[PDB]
Design a protein around this ligand. Sequence first.
Ligand SMILES: [Zn+2]
Lengths: 120, 134, 49, 30, 61
Amino acid sequence: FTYRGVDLDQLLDMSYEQLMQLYSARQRRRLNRGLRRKQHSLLKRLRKAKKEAPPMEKPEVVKTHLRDMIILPEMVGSMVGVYNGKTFNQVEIKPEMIGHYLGEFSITYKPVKHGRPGIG
Amino acid sequence: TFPPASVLLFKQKSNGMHSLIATGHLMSVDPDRMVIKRVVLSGHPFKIFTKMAVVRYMFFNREDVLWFKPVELRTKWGRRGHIKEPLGTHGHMKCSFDGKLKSQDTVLMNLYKRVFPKWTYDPYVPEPVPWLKS
Amino acid sequence: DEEAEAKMLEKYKQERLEEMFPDEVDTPRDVAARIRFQKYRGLKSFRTS
Amino acid sequence: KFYEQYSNRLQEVLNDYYKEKAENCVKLNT
Amino acid sequence: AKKRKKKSYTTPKKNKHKRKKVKLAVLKYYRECPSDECGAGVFMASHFDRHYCGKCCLTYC
RNA sequence: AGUGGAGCCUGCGGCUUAAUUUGACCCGGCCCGGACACGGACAGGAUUGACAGAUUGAUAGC
Ligand SMILES: [Zn+2]
């Protein structure tokens, strides 16, 4: 696995001011604006859940309402459930979801399967 | 029994007193006479627009409304309408009516099933005590 | 002894309730109405349906 | 009684307010 | 007019939280607050590390 | 000059939906909701207010 030609271990060692040379434009604008209190709260919650877990076992899920959250490369391996307005969806953070928001992993609408039309 | 025949209905009161509760006569014998028990379910129309309302407290699931969709709803003040859609996950429903409903009003529908008598016939009947007022 | 009188006053209350409101049943919140009223149906007209 | 009727601490609260107002987004912690 | 049935539907609201009652807490007083107004009368409550005020909320170490 | 044909956009029906608000809606969660009478508790505190830390989706001294 590699992301812009960078291996994940270097990404784990990749400094915060120099990840602003590596993401897309929207992600870099967000991290230059900085994360608010709730996103760091989720970060600390995920770090606690990953740290306080058996090594052979997947970590315990963390439920959240945060969909504005951008996936940092620290989170790979954490097991996160995210609300879509009605139901939590349980998702594993993969290596290939560094450049993605959480909210696009829980779809907030159901696909349209058209029924027979009424009187129009 | 072939009519004409008198009919008396008594109740076992207490300590052997048969209290006469009812009287009449025997009409024609048939098990073809349908007896229909009615249940009337009532709900409160709490969002009233013109000729359409949103009603609650009458069902409590989403598919409860879908099961009893084909039944016509009526109204305590004489209106007549029907269910369109359930909106909430709970039993909230959209109902279209003939005229505009009052906020004071009540929606209700009737459900029907044929009820049959219980086989509980026994020819033995206790001898009464002599009767007296209570 | 008093349980018979309790059912007596209950029957009094049920009789007074089924003349103010002739056949009204509060739908149960715990049992689904399609199951508790499973054998029931709606007639368009009690005369002609 | 009815008809006859008619600093350092503020600076500490100020700096606590400024700390919390900077703490809604810190942008630095890793 | 036409009257409504008034459904019952009992829902138990009895289990509501009440804060714990400390009985005769005047035993443990006998730090004094050197404040502008609440001096010489008010006792100055103890944590595990630091004592906090119950009237003016001053900050110490 | 066009529109009606075409791609896109918007409106109204219709269709899906938990909701697709309407000529504000949906999914969860904390809080409390009268007087008066009766029965308890209260000065051997009724109850308010409260800095820090832990909570659940929320910096909930509710
Ligand atoms: Zn204080």
